[PDB]
Amino acid sequence: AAQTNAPWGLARISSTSPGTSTYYYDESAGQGSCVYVIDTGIEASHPEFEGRAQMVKTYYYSSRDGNGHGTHCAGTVGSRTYGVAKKTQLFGVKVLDDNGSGQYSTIIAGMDFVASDKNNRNCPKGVVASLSLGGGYSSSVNSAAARLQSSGVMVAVAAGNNNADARNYSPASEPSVCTVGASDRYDRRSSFSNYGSVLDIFGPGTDILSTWIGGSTRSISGTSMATPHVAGLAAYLMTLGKTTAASACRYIADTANKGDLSNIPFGTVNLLAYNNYQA
């Protein structure tokens, strides 16, 4: 399948070269997979989700996304126009309030929730979790992300946005999950992207168009935006049978575009997520 005039990040993850604008992908499109977006919520009523999104847990007085960030990330995973995996099922877990903030204990509870709740959901092709959040190093937060991964969920986490080594941030620094840095449309590391040996992969993160609350769209930047490209890619590849939740991060790294990014510090992987799709 081909989606013309796609957002640059979708085109990038289906291309061996920067500078193209069509997204190419197998029409299975993540059907039969599920992606949990652990964030500020998801505006599931947005036409872009087509009934495929639903809120399943909140830790606040409402499940509404009053911020937009979670809706944007969910859109990059799985919206019809802005998403990598256009037929996946999206589940919202609101661990962040409408200011984008959350206590570490709430974030941990949300991760443990997903590890259990996936047993209540029909996801025969596999389960992914997208975590576009973080803060300072916490062994408890890392342990929770490791538990979620070990339960059979592909965990993709943002590296963080401090132009610093991700080893000092959580859950970015947990080795067993998939830690995602950000790149721009000219194949440069995004200026804010964290780096370091703990990174597994880069995805598009600068000027990413996706869904927003109020039935709208907008372009924003962050490792928060790179993470759902990788989560959606994992769901897409799991639906194709090419990998599993336990192996998908390694598979994405093995099949990535290699050596194409600039401003990668020595010791950080130079790997850009790529779907390897051949029409």
Distance between the termini: 8 Å
H/E series, N to C? EHEEEHEHEEHEEEEEEHHEE
Strand content: 15-25%
What's the CATH architecture?
A: 3-Layer(aba) Sandwich
CATH superfamily annotation: Peptidase S8/S53 domain
GO biological process, one term: proteolysis
Function: Hydrolyzes keratin at aromatic and hydrophobic residues.
Cofactor: Ca(2+)
EC number: 3.4.21.64
Provide structural commentary.
This protein is of the alpha/beta class and 279 residues long. It has a single domain (2-272), classed as Peptidase S8/S53 domain (Rossmann fold), CATH 3.40.50.200. 24% of the residues lie in helices and 22% in strands. α2 (69-78) packs parallel to α5 (223-239) and α3 runs parallel beside α4 (139-150). Its EC number is 3.4.21.64.
